[PDB]
């Protein structure tokens, strides 16, 4: 192994709260931290968690090519891992969703034979689903960088979700601290008008970045986007959501090969029918709650404090994880108050072992996770 | 206002660590918690954080329609909010990404005039980007439910990312505790063979669910998926990633209207060229680091412990947030050790105010966030 490592983590979109527990812990454990966040509470929070932090935001500048900024961000990180330190990069939202420097820095680090990992985080698209009450599954989701969408004239699906990032800097390769002059926005408004028509809805989406703020979820027509006062509101943290125009009919060849509207309807879709919550199926399913008992093959949790504790520290304590990863058996034996089954399950590391150790597994089942929460 | 509320939060995919700080805090604050998670460490962790929890997983059953399960899950939650309690639903990953019961339960609750919110979380798609080292921006991302993809014969873009959820239960509307017999998987393998050809790569992706485990990132050909031993490995937590076959050429009409390969290349793309990290642009940008000083319009953090504290509790303490949301001024005045500017910025709640209170704003700038981290 070569000394030094790079881990890139996210903070989520909304200030502090949308940081994951493993992001925070890796930040605490890092030798050097490099961060690029928008809001200052998040920044100040980060600075309390590690002493050796560097704000990457200072490598932006007026008129300066973002590509140069990204090279610089990524070089600054890889330099400290060549020195043998464990360095953590931090980017708002999800650190790999519309982010050049993370992918760049990890790819460089792995080519030189350093351990490199990205930990996922809550993206602005994630926030979009939550705030606009839509699900990517229904009826599919297409996601593009607004400029890339235009330059490679990427195809659109009228019967699916369309999400467009960086609508506030169409064609702009550089930066400005007072914001962009998004003067080529009308080119995008032309493209959407072509594909969706002038009265198709467009949702201007900006997720709250502070806990007390409401998101922006404003609905305009495509034509409205050309109005100067409306386009003015589109900025650097603007995302567009373009709902489907219609529902696509089901294929009859396929339904037969497989031998075969869910509430609620997508409210942003223009001509949605009202969908009923309590149809007969729903009525019947609900009546069954009265006498409902857990199926035979259901596995109730049956664990101990010692076991839940050790499984928590493995997830929250990167040091504990490193010891366990180095030797399952030695680690297992040294953790106190474990039953022989708990201690055995840690020794294997097996998902099955750990489920059997932590759950009251029924005989039927004994002789593999299955939790599907969407149906089409 | 009507008493009672519903908040749906996520736990992320990897056990405990991928839960966000605001998810955890709402779980702690809730009157009643209903959860649907895969792994038992996450479950046990949740049970330590609130006393009144109900496992929703017991409303699945062999042969039982998932739609009935989802109606039941959602009804159980809305029932407790009709009783006037503040109830939190918990679903693994992102609670609104391929999840019927969350959207269903919130839509019912809002139609009856109860406060209803979804908080986003780390999806399996989020984990995919991180583990497979890809970025949705480059070169766009299409995401479908595998059965929906077939039934509505949804169009594919050969020049973009394709992500397919629920590849392990093609056409299966029901549940089984010992896993699905995914016997109509060959229908999907036919569709992919049609659109991509028999030697196009397909990545079988399963994110580690436990901190010590490695993800599955196995690359098969489309033809290989028909081999019984290979299709056997596809399960309930399987996702497919289908890379682009080629790069789409740039539109010349559009580049002119806008008056106009980034390292690293997508390693899963079949015929990728090798991309250079240190081209001249990169060389030059890096040399500028030696004499680099923060631009004039850069705003260094300049805050106080009292201010960072209060901004942290607003994000981590839903009670503190509720008081602040009820009256900015009263709340601001009652928090100790705030400077007049800090205390004034809280009073307004304004993003600008709070940035000015927490950062040393340069004169130039004084007279609006802009943090774009991808370039095309
Ligand atoms: N608060 C927000 N609301 C909506 N979209 C946002 C927000 N912040 C960032 N974005 C989107 O993300 C783009 C900036 C990206 N370079 C970074 C995205 C970030 N990594 C994420 O996880 O979402 C912006 O142009 C927006 O399209
Ligand atoms: N560990 C995992 N690795 C890869 N994909 C997964 C994993 N767990 C769940 N999934 C995907 O999610 C589907 C189940 C969905 N109903 C729930 C998705 C979940 N809400 C999320 O945020 O990803 C599975 O069929 C997979 O396609």
Residue numbers in the entry:
A (entry chain A), B (entry chain A): 7 to 266, 278 to 384, 398 to 406
Which sentences from the paper describe this structure?
While chemical methylation of an amide bond uses a strong base to generate the imidate, OphA, the precursor protein of the fungal peptide macrocycle omphalotin A, self-hypermethylates amides at pH 7 using S-adenosyl methionine (SAM) as cofactor. Omphalotin A derives from the C terminus of the OphA protein, and it is the OphA protein that methylates its own C terminus using S-adenosyl methionine (SAM). The structure of OphA reveals a complex catenane-like arrangement in which the peptide substrate is clamped with its amide nitrogen aligned for nucleophilic attack on the methyl group of SAM. Here, we report the structure of the peptide amide methyltransferase OphA including complexes with cofactor [SAM and S-adenosyl homocysteine (SAH)], cofactor analog, substrate, and product.
Superposition of both sinefungin complexes with the OphAΔC6 Y63F-SAH, OphAΔC18-SAM, and OphAΔC18-SAH complexes shows similar consistency in the protein structure, cofactor, and where present substrate positions. We conclude that the extensive hydrogen-bonding network at the active site and the catenane-like arrangement lead to a highly rigid active site. In both sinefungin complexes, the two nitrogen atoms (sinefungin and amide) approach close enough to form a hydrogen bond (distance varies between 3.1 and 3.3 Å).
